[PDB]
Design a protein around this motif. Sequence first.
Motif, PDB file in Angstrom:
ATOM      1  N   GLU A  58       0.842  -1.188   0.000  1.00 19.92           N
ATOM      2  CA  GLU A  58       0.000   0.000   0.000  1.00 19.92           C
ATOM      3  C   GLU A  58       0.884   1.248   0.000  1.00 19.92           C
ATOM      4  OE1 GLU A  58      -2.619  -0.436   3.319  1.00 19.92           O
ATOM      5  OE2 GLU A  58      -3.868  -1.952   2.359  1.00 19.92           O
ATOM      6  N   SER A  59       0.256   2.407   0.201  1.00 16.88           N
ATOM      7  CA  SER A  59       0.958   3.689   0.197  1.00 16.88           C
ATOM      8  C   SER A  59       0.445   4.523   1.363  1.00 16.88           C
ATOM      9  CB  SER A  59       0.754   4.424  -1.126  1.00 16.88           C
ATOM     10  OG  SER A  59      -0.607   4.778  -1.297  1.00 16.88           O
ATOM     11  N   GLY A  60       1.300   4.746   2.358  1.00 15.81           N
ATOM     12  CA  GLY A  60       0.901   5.422   3.579  1.00 15.81           C
ATOM     13  C   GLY A  60       0.739   6.926   3.472  1.00 15.81           C
ATOM     14  N   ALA A  61      -0.457   7.416   3.791  1.00 26.50           N
ATOM     15  CA  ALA A  61      -0.755   8.842   3.855  1.00 26.50           C
ATOM     16  C   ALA A  61      -1.242   9.160   5.261  1.00 26.50           C
ATOM     17  CB  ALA A  61      -1.801   9.236   2.812  1.00 26.50           C
ATOM     18  N   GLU A  62      -0.530  10.047   5.955  1.00 24.36           N
ATOM     19  CA  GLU A  62      -0.749  10.213   7.389  1.00 24.36           C
ATOM     20  C   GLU A  62      -1.748  11.321   7.711  1.00 24.36           C
ATOM     21  OE1 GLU A  62       0.470   8.351   9.910  1.00 24.36           O
ATOM     22  OE2 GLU A  62       1.386   6.987   8.460  1.00 24.36           O
ATOM     23  N   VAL A  63      -1.380  12.572   7.465  1.00 23.32           N
ATOM     24  CA  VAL A  63      -2.102  13.716   8.008  1.00 23.32           C
ATOM     25  C   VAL A  63      -3.158  14.160   7.006  1.00 23.32           C
ATOM     26  CG1 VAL A  63      -1.934  16.085   8.809  1.00 23.32           C
ATOM     27  CG2 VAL A  63      -0.177  14.436   9.440  1.00 23.32           C
ATOM     28  N   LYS A  64      -4.417  14.146   7.441  1.00 27.08           N
ATOM     29  CA  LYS A  64      -5.540  14.621   6.642  1.00 27.08           C
ATOM     30  C   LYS A  64      -6.549  15.255   7.585  1.00 27.08           C
ATOM     31  CE  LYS A  64      -6.086  14.103   2.835  1.00 27.08           C
ATOM     32  NZ  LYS A  64      -5.703  14.957   1.678  1.00 27.08           N
ATOM     33  N   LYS A  65      -6.854  16.529   7.362  1.00 30.38           N
ATOM     34  CA  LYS A  65      -7.733  17.257   8.262  1.00 30.38           C
ATOM     35  C   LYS A  65      -9.183  16.802   8.078  1.00 30.38           C
ATOM     36  CE  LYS A  65      -6.498  21.634   9.412  1.00 30.38           C
ATOM     37  NZ  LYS A  65      -7.952  21.625   9.734  1.00 30.38           N
ATOM     38  N   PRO A  66      -9.992  16.837   9.146  1.00 27.81           N
ATOM     39  CA  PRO A  66     -11.366  16.312   9.060  1.00 27.81           C
ATOM     40  C   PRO A  66     -12.253  17.146   8.144  1.00 27.81           C
ATOM     41  CG  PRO A  66     -10.627  16.339  11.327  1.00 27.81           C
ATOM     42  CD  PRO A  66      -9.603  17.097  10.544  1.00 27.81           C
ATOM     43  N   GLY A  67     -13.021  16.453   7.305  1.00 28.39           N
ATOM     44  CA  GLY A  67     -13.885  17.068   6.323  1.00 28.39           C
ATOM     45  C   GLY A  67     -13.430  16.869   4.895  1.00 28.39           C
ATOM     46  N   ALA A  68     -12.168  16.509   4.689  1.00 30.78           N
ATOM     47  CA  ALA A  68     -11.597  16.371   3.359  1.00 30.78           C
ATOM     48  C   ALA A  68     -11.762  14.934   2.864  1.00 30.78           C
ATOM     49  CB  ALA A  68     -10.134  16.805   3.370  1.00 30.78           C
ATOM     50  N   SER A  69     -11.060  14.597   1.786  1.00 35.10           N
ATOM     51  CA  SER A  69     -11.103  13.269   1.193  1.00 35.10           C
ATOM     52  C   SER A  69      -9.720  12.641   1.259  1.00 35.10           C
ATOM     53  CB  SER A  69     -11.584  13.333  -0.258  1.00 35.10           C
ATOM     54  OG  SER A  69     -11.550  12.055  -0.861  1.00 35.10           O
ATOM     55  N   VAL A  70      -9.657  11.398   1.724  1.00 30.90           N
ATOM     56  CA  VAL A  70      -8.410  10.647   1.812  1.00 30.90           C
ATOM     57  C   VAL A  70      -8.488   9.477   0.834  1.00 30.90           C
ATOM     58  CG1 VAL A  70      -9.189   9.228   3.787  1.00 30.90           C
ATOM     59  CG2 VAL A  70      -6.720   9.628   3.427  1.00 30.90           C
ATOM     60  N   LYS A  71      -7.357   9.157   0.208  1.00 28.84           N
ATOM     61  CA  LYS A  71      -7.298   8.140  -0.833  1.00 28.84           C
ATOM     62  C   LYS A  71      -6.170   7.169  -0.525  1.00 28.84           C
ATOM     63  CE  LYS A  71      -7.057   7.556  -5.853  1.00 28.84           C
ATOM     64  NZ  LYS A  71      -8.390   6.914  -5.993  1.00 28.84           N
ATOM     65  N   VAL A  72      -6.448   5.872  -0.663  1.00 29.41           N
ATOM     66  CA  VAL A  72      -5.485   4.820  -0.362  1.00 29.41           C
ATOM     67  C   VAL A  72      -5.402   3.883  -1.565  1.00 29.41           C
ATOM     68  CG1 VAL A  72      -7.162   3.295   0.814  1.00 29.41           C
ATOM     69  CG2 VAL A  72      -4.731   3.189   1.444  1.00 29.41           C
ATOM     70  N   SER A  73      -4.209   3.348  -1.816  1.00 29.82           N
ATOM     71  CA  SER A  73      -3.931   2.506  -2.968  1.00 29.82           C
ATOM     72  C   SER A  73      -3.601   1.083  -2.522  1.00 29.82           C
ATOM     73  CB  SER A  73      -2.783   3.092  -3.790  1.00 29.82           C
ATOM     74  OG  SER A  73      -1.570   3.049  -3.061  1.00 29.82           O
ATOM     75  N   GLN A 131       0.276  -4.136   4.298  1.00 27.47           N
ATOM     76  CA  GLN A 131       0.933  -3.742   5.540  1.00 27.47           C
ATOM     77  C   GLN A 131       0.160  -2.687   6.321  1.00 27.47           C
ATOM     78  OE1 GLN A 131       1.849  -2.791   2.542  1.00 27.47           O
ATOM     79  NE2 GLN A 131       2.688  -0.713   2.526  1.00 27.47           N
ATOM     80  N   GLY A 132      -0.720  -1.939   5.675  1.00 22.98           N
ATOM     81  CA  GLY A 132      -1.523  -0.983   6.413  1.00 22.98           C
ATOM     82  C   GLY A 132      -1.113   0.455   6.163  1.00 22.98           C
ATOM     83  N   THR A 133      -2.098   1.350   6.199  1.00 22.36           N
ATOM     84  CA  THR A 133      -1.871   2.787   6.103  1.00 22.36           C
ATOM     85  C   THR A 133      -2.560   3.464   7.274  1.00 22.36           C
ATOM     86  OG1 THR A 133      -3.816   3.113   4.698  1.00 22.36           O
ATOM     87  CG2 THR A 133      -1.702   2.745   3.594  1.00 22.36           C
ATOM     88  N   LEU A 134      -1.772   3.981   8.210  1.00 24.86           N
ATOM     89  CA  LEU A 134      -2.324   4.751   9.314  1.00 24.86           C
ATOM     90  C   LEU A 134      -2.593   6.176   8.847  1.00 24.86           C
ATOM     91  CD1 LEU A 134      -1.630   6.725  12.129  1.00 24.86           C
ATOM     92  CD2 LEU A 134      -3.160   4.749  12.240  1.00 24.86           C
ATOM     93  N   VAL A 135      -3.752   6.709   9.227  1.00 28.00           N
ATOM     94  CA  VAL A 135      -4.109   8.079   8.893  1.00 28.00           C
ATOM     95  C   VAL A 135      -4.267   8.872  10.184  1.00 28.00           C
ATOM     96  CG1 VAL A 135      -5.230   7.371   6.747  1.00 28.00           C
ATOM     97  CG2 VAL A 135      -6.578   7.684   8.819  1.00 28.00           C
ATOM     98  N   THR A 136      -4.209  10.195  10.048  1.00 27.56           N
ATOM     99  CA  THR A 136      -4.229  11.101  11.186  1.00 27.56           C
ATOM    100  C   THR A 136      -5.167  12.257  10.860  1.00 27.56           C
ATOM    101  OG1 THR A 136      -1.935  10.470  11.667  1.00 27.56           O
ATOM    102  CG2 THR A 136      -2.739  12.451  12.761  1.00 27.56           C
TER     103      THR A 136
END
Lengths: 72, 72, 127, 127, 109, 109, 495, 99, 50
Positions: free
Chosen positions: C6-21, C120-125
Motif C-alpha cells: 500500500e501507500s501510507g498517507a498520514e495527516v488529513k484534516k477532518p472534512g476532506a477526502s483521503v485516498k489509499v492505494s 501492511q496498512g496505512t495509518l491516517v491522522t
Amino acid sequence: SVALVPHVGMGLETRTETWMSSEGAWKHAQRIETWILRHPGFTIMAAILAYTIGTTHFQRALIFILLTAVAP
Amino acid sequence: SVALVPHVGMGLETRTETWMSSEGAWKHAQRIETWILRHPGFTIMAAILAYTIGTTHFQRALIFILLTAVAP
Amino acid sequence: EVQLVESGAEVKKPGASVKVSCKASGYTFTSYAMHWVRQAPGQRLEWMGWINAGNGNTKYSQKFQDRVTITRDTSASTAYMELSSLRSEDTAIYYCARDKVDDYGDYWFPTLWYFDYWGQGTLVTVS
Amino acid sequence: EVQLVESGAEVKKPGASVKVSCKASGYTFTSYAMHWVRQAPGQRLEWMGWINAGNGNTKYSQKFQDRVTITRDTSASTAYMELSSLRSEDTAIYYCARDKVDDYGDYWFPTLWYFDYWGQGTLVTVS
Amino acid sequence: SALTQPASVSGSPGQSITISCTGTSSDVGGFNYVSWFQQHPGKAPKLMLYDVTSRPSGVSSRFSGSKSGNTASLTISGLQAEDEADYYCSSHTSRGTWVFGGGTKLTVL
Amino acid sequence: SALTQPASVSGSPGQSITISCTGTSSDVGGFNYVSWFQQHPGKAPKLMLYDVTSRPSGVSSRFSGSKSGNTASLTISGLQAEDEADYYCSSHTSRGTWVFGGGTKLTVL
Amino acid sequence: MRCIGISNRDFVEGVSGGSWVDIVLEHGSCVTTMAKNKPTLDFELIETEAKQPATLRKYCIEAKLTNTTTDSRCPTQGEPSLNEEQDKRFVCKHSMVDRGWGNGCGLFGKGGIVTCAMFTCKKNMKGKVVQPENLEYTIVITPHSGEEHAVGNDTGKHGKEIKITPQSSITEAELTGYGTVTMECSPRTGLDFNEMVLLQMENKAWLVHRQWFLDLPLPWLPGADTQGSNWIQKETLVTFKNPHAKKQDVVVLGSQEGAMHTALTGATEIQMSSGNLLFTGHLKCRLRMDKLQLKGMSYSMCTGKFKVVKEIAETQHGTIVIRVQYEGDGSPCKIPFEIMDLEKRHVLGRLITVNPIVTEKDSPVNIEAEPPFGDSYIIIGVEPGQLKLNWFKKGSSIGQMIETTMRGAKRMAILGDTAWDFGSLGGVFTSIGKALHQVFGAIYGAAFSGVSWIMKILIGVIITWIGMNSRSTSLSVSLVLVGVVTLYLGVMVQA
Amino acid sequence: KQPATLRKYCIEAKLTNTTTDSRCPTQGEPSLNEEQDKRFVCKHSMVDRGWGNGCGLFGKGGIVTCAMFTCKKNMKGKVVQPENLEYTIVITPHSGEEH
Amino acid sequence: LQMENKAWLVHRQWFLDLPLPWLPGADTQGSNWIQKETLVTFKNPHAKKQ
Ligand SMILES: *[C@@H]1O[C@H](CO)[C@@H](O)[C@H](O)[C@H]1NC(C)=O
Ligand SMILES: *[C@@H]1O[C@H](CO)[C@@H](O)[C@H](O)[C@H]1NC(C)=O
Ligand SMILES: *[C@@H]1O[C@H](CO)[C@@H](O)[C@H](O)[C@H]1NC(C)=O
C-alpha cells in the motif's frame, strides 16, 4: 408485452384516421408471408395435416389458413 | 413491430436458460385467456361457426381452437 | 512471492477526502477480488470493503454506504479507495485483503479461504 | 534490374505548372500500373497519382481531385505527372511506383505485392 | 453487528486454551464460513484457520476448530510463548457481508 | 484516411521493437492489404513486406508482420546500426485509394 | 472434487475400444470419468470467447427528427419537389391534400404534398459475426485428489485450465502426480457459427440467429460504415400523420429498446463487456487415457485409527462424501476404505475417489463413493480402531434407471445428434443411431421451425389423433416416433 | 375542460440497491426486510449448494433478490366526465361575398 | 392518455389492462408501483446465482 393487444377492434373510430392507418393495417399480413418464405417446412407439413383431416375442400383450405395463421 | 416474431423457434437452444424463459412461456396463453373474458361474443360466434363446419367432433374442436387462437 | 503493498498517507484534516492505494503483484489481478478492512487503533477490525473484480462490481456495506467509494484499475494492477468527509472516528489503519473470483467472473460466493494475504496498512491522522 | 529514373524541376511559382516525368525501362510498360506520391519532409506520403494503365484510366483522389491533370505515353515508355496551381505547401519530394495489371486489361483489384520499385526523388520549390 | 468472543484469555505454556465466537444463524449457525485470524502487535494479521477445521500451509499442526451450532471455537494444543497474539474471527453472512469478532488477546506468563 | 503509428521508437541491438497502426473497418481490419516501407534519408523507399507477413527478395528474413484486429504490427528482431530508417505503413482501402503512415524514427542509443 | 454439488452432472465409465472415451460437456454440466484403473477426473467448460469480431449490420433503436420542410402544389399539376429530397438522410412521403380557392390555387381538386424530415440516430444496436476459427474454449481438468477443503470448489487453484482453439492442437496437460492427459476436441462442430450474430445492446448482448438478425423491421445501415447517417429502412421508424385531407406532419416513433427486449425472448444471453465471453453451448471432446498414472500405487496400507472430521453427507445422484484424517505414523500410504453390507461379507457399493490416499501430512482427505440402495456399512480402516459408519440411501431401486432414462432423453432433447457422442464407439449400434438420429432430426429440422412452446404440443395432438384413427398398421408409425416424441419435445423446450 | 388522472403507468424505469439473501437447503426460504417494502421487487428461486459454498448437506438452497424499482418516465391517462365538455360549431351562410 | 408530448383517445377497459407497472392516479410520491413484474426480468442461469 404491451406491444401486443394493439387497440383495434373496439369501436371508437371516426372519419379521422388513426395513429397507424396504412402502416398497422398490413403488418400482420407481411410477417406471416415472410415467415412462410423463411420457414417452408411447417407450410408443407401444415398442408399435409390440413389435407389429411378434412372432408371437403373448404375445410382443408380453412384448417390450412388457420394453422398458417396461428404460427408467428 | 419488432416485438412480433419473437425469436422462438430457431434451434440454438441449450441447457442454459434463455433471456425470458418462464416470463414468455405462458404470456400467450394468459393473453388469449384475458382476451376471451373481455370479448366473449367472438367465442360464442366462433363456437357456432366451428360447429356447423367439419362434421366430426375433432374437426369442430380444431376449428374452434384455431379460430379462437388467431384473433389476438 | 505474492505481495500486497500500500501507500501510507498520514495527516488529513477532518472534512476532506483521503485516498489509499493497493499495488498488487504475484498474480493476475483481474481474476482475484480485493477487500478493504479497517482497524480502529487498539480494537476490533471492521469490514469496509466493496467486492471489486475484473468488471468492477461492489457490495453495499450498510454502515459504510454513502461516505466511502471505491475504484479499480486494470492496467497498473491497483485498487483504490476514497473516503470522503472523514472524522475523528474515521481515523484508523486501513488493510487490503484478497479473495478469489468465480469461474464466470461473477464474484458472489466467496472462497472458503478468503483473506489470504493482506497489505501492511496505512495509518491516517486527523486534526 | 528495374530502375525508375525521373525528371527534375529547378524552381516554380505558386500558381504555375510544375511537371515531372519517369523514364521506365528494363521491363514491359504497356501492361503495368504507374502511381505518383508526394512526401513532405518527415510527413505523410500523399498519394497524388492515379491508376494508369495501357489506356490511362483515372481514380479521383479526394484531396487532389480538381487541381491535378495527368497523362501518359506508350511510344516513349514514360509516364507524365504535372500539377497546376501550386501553393506554399506543395514544395516536397516526389516518387514513382510499379504494379501489375490483371490480364483482362482492367485494373481496379490491386495485386498483393504492390509498390515493387520506386523513383529517386526530384525536389520542387516555390518563390 | 459483531461476534462476541471474550476480551482476553490466558494459560500456562503447554496446555490447551479455547477461544470461542458466538453469533446468530445469519453467518455461523447456517454457514461454515468461520475463519480465524491472529495478529502480532507489529502490524497486519495472518490467515490462520479456514472454514471450520482446515488450516493454511505453514500453520503449525496444532490449531483446531469446531462449530456447535451458533458457536465456533478455537483451541491451541501445546501452547508456547510464541502464540501471544490478538485472535480475531470472520464470517460470511447470508446477506453477503462479512462480520468480525470482538477481539481476543492471549498471554502465556 | 491516415494511420496512427507512434512517431518515435527506440531499442538496443538484441531486443525486439513493435510498431502498431490502428485502422478503420474498411482499410486495415477488413482487408489483407497491409504493407510496410522503410526509407533511408538519402535513398528512395523500397518494398519490404507483402500482403500481411510475406517478404520480397533482398532483405534478410528478419522482419515479420502481423494483424491483430485493427492493429498491424511490425516486429523487428536483432537490431543493427544501418536500420535507422523511417518505417512507414501502407494500406489499400475499400473504395480504391491508398493510405499511409505518418512516420517512425528509430535509433539504438 | 469441484464437480460434487454442481447439479445435472453425469458420470462415464469405460475407456473401451482403445484407451479413449468420447464425452460432450456443456457449460452447466460437469462430466466425471471412471475406468477399471486410471484415476477419476472432473471436466467442464468455464469460458468461451470469440476473439476478433466484425460488425455485420447496425440497427437504429431510437431516432429524432429535425428540420421539417414541406412542399405542396396545385391539383392536376404534377408532383411537389423539394431540395432536401435529393439527400437521403431526409425521409419523405407523397400524399394527397385537397385544395381550392381558399388555399389559393384554383381548380378545386386534390393536390400533392411532400414532407421532409432528417433522420438522426442516437441509440445504436450492432451485431458482430465471428467465423468458427479464432475462438477460444477453456476447459478445466480437476482429478479427485482428495485434497483438503477442495470439494464443490468452483474457485481456487486446484486443477488445470487449458485453452483450446481450432488454431490449437492435441493440447496435452501434465496435471502433476497423475501424469498427462490429451483431449482431441472438435471446436468447430459444436456451437455452429456463421448462423450466429453476437448482438449487442447498450450494456447487454445476445446470441441470435443470423437470418433472424438480418430481417428486423428497424432502420439499418451496413456494418463497415463511418459517418453513420445513410439509414436505409427509415420508413419503419417514422409515421406520416395525414389525419384529415388537410396537410400532414411527421413524428418519430420512440425507442424499441423495451420493444426488442420482448423480441429477444428465447435468445440466450452472452456477455460482450470486456471480450466477447459466451456461456452457451457444448464442446465434443475425445478423451484418451493411456498415460494416467494413478498417484497412490507403490504406497503401503494404513495401521488404522482414522478420525472423521466432517459428517458423511450425500449429494444429488446418491453418493456420500466423507472427510477423514489419519492418526499415527507412516503417513504417505493408502486408505482401507470399503463399503459393505449387513452380515459383513459381500463388498457392494463402489468408489468414485478410487485409491484414497493420505498425502504425507495431517491433512484431511475427501472420499466420494456410491453406496447401495439400502442399509450399508462404510468401513474406513483395519481392525485396531476401524470406523463402521452406518448409512441408508433412499429409494434407488428401479427409480434410478427410470430417472436416467428421462435424463438421457433430455440430453437427446437439448443436444441433437451430439448426444450419441457420449460413449466410446458402440459401432454396430451407436454409429448407426447417430445417422438415423441425423436423418430423423434432419427432416424434423426442416419442419417445426419457428413453431413455439404450444404449437409443438398441438401438432403432437394432431399426429397422435391421426395415428390413433388410421389403419394398415400405421398406428405405431404415427404415434411412437412423431405423435409422442413431438409432445415430449413440446414440453422440453423453451429452456 | 377539467380532466383528472385515474391511473399512471411507467414507461422507463431503473433499478438500484440490489440485495440478496441465501440459505442452506433444508432450512426453508430466506427473508429480507426489503421484501415487504413495496418499492422493492422480489422473487424466490433456488441455487444449488454444497461444501464449496460453505454450506453443507449438498442440496438446492433457497435464494431471494431485491431491487428498488425507480420510475423515470410516465404515461398518465386523464379522464373526463360527460359534462364540462365544450364543443364549438361555426355557422356560415352562402352569401355572395369575396374571400 | 398522454405520452411525453403526444395524446390519444382510448377507451378505459383497454387502458386498465395494459401489462405495465401502474400507480393510482391522484397521488404524491410513488413508491407503490403495483405490477412491477412486467418491466423487470430475473435471470437464473445454470442454477447458480441470479
Ligand atoms: C467528380 O470528379 C471531379 C474531378 O475533378 C471533381 O471536381 C468533382 O467534384 C467530382 N464530383 C463529386 C460529386 O465528387
Ligand atoms: C438543421 O437544423 C439546424 C437548427 O435548426 C440548422 O442549423 C441546420 O442547418 C439544419 N440542417 C440543414 C441541412 O439545413
Ligand atoms: C441505495 O444506495 C444508495 C447509495 O448511494 C443510497 O441512496 C441508499 O443507501 C440506498 N437506498 C435505499 C436502500 O433505499
